[PDB]
């Protein structure tokens, strides 16, 4: 809809499952692990934050090249 | 512009031989395993039918 | 418009003439067949959905490349 | 974003040396013989008029 | 504003002084001399039609390659 | 999208020492002669005010 | 389009210990001395937080 | 949001604090200074206008190359 400014494109995930991994974010096609919550709540303004079963992080990961 | 960086679409069928929840990502052609992760991407990409017999098509339509 | 999500650019097409060739699409500059109606309507989500007389297909596929 | 993969435009005159209907589609000038088949492109390009004594002006400009 | 569907770029010109050139355009950088009003109100429909004095064509077409 | 094909601006003084209007379009600046095509261009790209003493910084930010 | 030629984003932690104001602007990151400067790019790029523990991950994947 | 018909790129900054240094602009990642007030109010109409401190316009040319 309306243009990035921000010059990152990508997504937070997080499982609600019963192995939770956490926090993590593919940033500019590099996934890292986020430590902070403060962390989650800043990139929350500016990507969007989604869920994704542990079991499919290893296809994501694949299409996200 | 799109900030999610995620082109591409989950497809699947409701006929009587189903092949699950796949979908198309940046090109790459995935099978999803869990209802939690189709329902995380269906808040950022489309998510359309497609019957059995037409995902042949679809593949060679694609990349 | 709106920004294309589905990494999709083409349309359906068929003929309500009195020869029916079926429902078609264009995907990417690729010409296929499609074999279901589950199959048009779900791309009737995401792309356009055009009527071509059977007699026009030969020049439209000249310009789809 | 353009999502039907088609740009140009349906060409007609209303004069009285009348050459059909046309269409520049992805810079590729055709012919367009039934009136279905230019009602479906009127969903997705612009029709517009073309006297015939400026259609080689237009071949040039396109292409 | 709005994306461009006709693959055309460019606009008519006239000039309403006294001594007119009739009307011309610039499509995709050529410059094209127009016969018929026909024509003229066809491409109002997709490109901008605005005024330009004889006295300052040859300075437009410099700039328009 | 921008239809017109012209990318720039018109630009002038309202000081004491005129320098006309003049015009960067596509990078490439020009002299415009008359206030009918002033007025012209004024429907497809901005107009803006620029000191006499401005323009040589203009000119090197510009192409 | 984006008129101000800058991409990027302000970034801070709100912890307790501060690296004071960054930013990442085209790619490059620099650090931001004067709370003038904060509010005169929050004008024009987001401003976000990130704790002092995840700067390192946020670097690599950026440029 | 809306596109860019000017083909400039860029804002204009200034300082309020004790040690102004004029107005200056980056246009099309060039740097410049401006002399006169009314090449600022012609350029507010089309580049943003933004406080930058003295302190930290070398670390802002680094970042516009």
Chains 1, 3, 5, 8 share one sequence.
Do not use: C, W
């Not at 993590?24 to 403060?38: M, P, S, T, Y």
Request: a negative charge; aromatic letters at 8%; charged letters at 25%.
């Amino acid at each position: 809809n309306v243009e990035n400014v921000s010059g990152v494109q990508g997504f937070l995930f997080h499982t609600d499952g019963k192995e939770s991994y956490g926090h993590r974010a593919f940033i500019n096609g590099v996934e890292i692990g986020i430590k902070d919550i403060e962390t989650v709540q800043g990139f929350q303004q500016i990507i969007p934050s989604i869920n994704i079963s542990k079991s499919d992080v290893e296809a994501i990961r694949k299409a996200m090249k």
